[PDB]
Each structure stands twice: as structure tokens, then as C-alpha cells.
Amino acid sequence: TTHFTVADRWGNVVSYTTTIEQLFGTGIMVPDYGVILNNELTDFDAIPGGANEVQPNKRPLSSMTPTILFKDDKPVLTVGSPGGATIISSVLQTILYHIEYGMELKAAVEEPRIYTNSMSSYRYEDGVPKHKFGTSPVDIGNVQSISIDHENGTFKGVADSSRNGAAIGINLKRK
């Protein structure tokens, strides 16, 4: 999965999460055409019955959560992340740190995260200070985010250090 975002000078804002499921999907490549195929249907429940059971022509449930926050009807922040079930945890924590704790956006994105979806499943990042949390940390999610300052007419872009990601602002210049 990957998440990216774009904002332009005309007020359009895009927040876009996109995936082939697993890394390399099924691993199947369409021969002579170079296209790698998703394993997306494994996001369905394996045992049917099931709000998220398999059905023909049904879409499997996704944890992808591209989001835009608004203030006084204008977009001010985009947030999203890859990371399977952990996605909502990454998006929630980023917003919590930036808004509730009033941290600057890059700091909010870099604040060590936790995830747990059950009593048997826990993850934490380096350093939440030294439940069933394990003995070593792991990176959780990869948040790309844009903040929009309507007053100064500027944008701030942030890529999460968990991947090689890049923010590139547009600053048109007269010679």
C-alpha cells in the first residue's frame, strides 16, 4: 500500500491511498506485460458468513483511510497511510499529535506510535519509553501529509521517515 497527496494553487486537494495488498501482491506478473497482480481478495474473511464474507462482484473490506480535515469549510490538512490494519492507528495518532497536542506537522508524523487490534496483537515504535507489547519495536505506517495555510497562502508537505518519501513544494519565480 502507499499514500500520497497533492494540493494546487486553485484550491484542489487530493488525498489518495492505493495498493496491491501484500508487497508485490500475489507475486503474479502478467507475462509479456509486466503488470503485477493484487491479492486483494484475501482482505475478505476466509470463513464466510460474515459482513466481510466473499461474494462474487463484492469488494473486500479495506483499511485504507485517506482523509482531509477542514476548518471553516476549507481543507486544512490531508492525512493517510499504508500499513494494513494499522492504518487507522497511524492516521488517528498523527491527527491527535498535530491537533490535540498542537505539535508541528513533521513532529506529529514522527511521534512514536502504537497499535493493537486484540489481546494477542501489539506493536510499538522506537521509543515509546521502556497488555502484551513485545521485546522489540517495529515501524508503524508511513504518513504523507499536507497542511494548508489559507492566510499566508502557503502549503507544508511532510513525508514520514519510515520510507524514502519526498515532499516538493511549488514556488514559481520571476527572473
Binding site: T2, F4, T5, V6, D8, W10, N12, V13, V14, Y16, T18, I20, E21, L23, F24, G25, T26, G27, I28, M29, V30, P31, G34, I36, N38, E40, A46, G50, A51, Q55, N57, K58, R59, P60, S62, M64, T65, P66, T67, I68, L69, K71, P75, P82, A85, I88, S89, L92, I95, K106, I114, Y115, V128, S145, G157, N164, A167, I168, G169, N171
Partner: protein, 359 residues
Amino acid sequence: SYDEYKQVDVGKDGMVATAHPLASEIGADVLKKGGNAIDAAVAIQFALNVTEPMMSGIGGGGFMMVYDGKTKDTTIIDSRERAPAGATPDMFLDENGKAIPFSERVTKGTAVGVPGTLKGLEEALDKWGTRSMKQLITPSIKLAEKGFPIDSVLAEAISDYQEKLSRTAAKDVFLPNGEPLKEGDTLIQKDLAKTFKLIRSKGTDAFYKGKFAKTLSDTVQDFGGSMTEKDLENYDITIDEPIWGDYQGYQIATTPPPSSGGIFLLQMPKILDHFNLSDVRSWEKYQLLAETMHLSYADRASYAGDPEFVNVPLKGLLHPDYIKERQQLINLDQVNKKPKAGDPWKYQEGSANYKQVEQ
């Protein structure tokens, strides 16, 4: 050099943020050259498809949320894959029948959904585009045809997923003489470059029809899946309406089912609000985060699926009185060892059309 790129930037005209510097350069160029955000996003998806090939592109699907500068409406191009017409509710069960182990499951033709990404890109350009798919795909044709240097994350992925790659035609691209490509090695994707050139010349029918559709289908069947040329022909995206919540003076626009994420992104801060979060590294904060997650993720497993097929109790999951019930289950110093789904149906009309089943 990848080393020279920013993870924080500013601009007055524009901003792009993506997980690969070459995709970011491509999107920013589109903005430089007078594109909009939608144009640039479409260019970025094709670039990521080439440069971050393990993570997304035209073999997959996604959710593209767009605020429209023009209309002030927020909408979502939902290009999530569909199961083929030949799919069955027990397709991931063995003969007994219990579940083909995950890691095997991944790996089968039955796992392949009808890809939506390219249909979504076409839709986005139809709605908001000021540049043609021809213009926007071209920089990625060059990256596929001519190469770029692989970054550390792609390098680790090729290494980590070598067995799965081995197994298939992907090995010719990523494993090219039986050895994994390494960080800084040039990745060339000739066949993918040819597929993008077909799309440039013929449009999306290059993918959803004729001779590519036939080969995609044939390949899935050969791996054990039921996907057909008609499944590809039938595919369209959906336009989804964001679900909204109030949060600390802001409004959160987020993605509805078939995403599970939006509902619980809205639910978690509603549950957390009572507790006033707010030291950033205290055990208290992490405890409250974890307890809340346990409740919301339990609700997710019980109540979420594709709303074209199943009755998701949205109203009921984010009803204030339901939120209060969930908040009452959470205590600062202890942990609920037995977190379970609540009962959101008390707070709304109708009933579930599905059963609770252990996975």
C-alpha cells in the same frame, strides 16, 4: 541522489508528498507546467507503479479523495477491486474445510481482484483533468523503459519476497539472473513500459479489453482463479460520499465502507474525547489509546463490509449513546482482557444481514 530530497517542504503555489522521490518529482513537474492537483495525482500513481512497484499501481485499486476547488464538493473515486463472477464464499477453504494458511492464500489466483486503479485514473481525468492521460503517463513510460536506481525499501522488498517472485514471470524483472536486484541497481521494466504505451495509444481499453485482458484472465485461471475477460469488461469504479465527523473545531472528511477505516477513525476520537487525552509520552495516554483500539477494532471485525452487499450499522456505531456505552468499558488502570464488539443495532433501525463468525 535520493539523499538530497526533503521530507519537509514548503510552497506558495503547490505541494506534493509521496513515498518516492521520483514520483514526487514527476507530480511536482506537472504542477510546475500548469497541471492541477488531479493531473499531478494521476501522474504520481503511474510513477509509483514503476518506482514503488511492490506497493501499488494498475494491478490494484485504491480510494482517491478529492476536494474540488471549483464546486467545493468532496468526493471519492473508489477503485477498489471486485471479486470475479466466479468467486465463491468458501474459495479460501481447503477440502475439510479450514482456511488455506494466509501466506499460501496470498499467492493463489483466487486472491486476484479485478483491478480498478486505471479505471479510477481515467475517471479522475474525465471529471477534473486538464492534461491527457497521454501526457501524464509519458514520464513513467521513460522510467519503465530506461530504468531508474532502486531505493533501499524496494531493495529490501525484492530480497524479503524473493520466494514469491521466484514462482512467476516476475522473476524475469526482479530476479533477473536468479539474483535479487540490490539498492542502487538499475530496474528496467520493458514489458510494463510497453503496457503503458498501449494505454497511451488506445486508452484504458488496452487494459480492460482485447489481448491484455485475455492474457490477464488466462494467467489468473492458470493460477487457480476464476477471473474472466467479461469480469474485466464489466468493471467500473464507484463515486463514494465521504463520511464526516466533528473534531476539536475541525471537520474530518473520511472514507465510508467498503473502507473500514473511516468509521473507526471517526469512532476512536469520539470514545477518547471523554478522557481528555491531552504528557505525550505517559503510560496514561498509551493505555487509553490501546483500550479504545481494542473496542473499535472488535466492532470492525463484527460489522464492516461492502455496503452494496451488507448492512453496516454506521448510524448505530457512531451514535452518542453508543459512544457512551463504549467509553464506560474503559478504565485508566486496568485493562479489559475480554474486549468485544458492542451492540450498535440498539441505536438504529434495521438489522444485520450476516452472522458473527470466528476467523
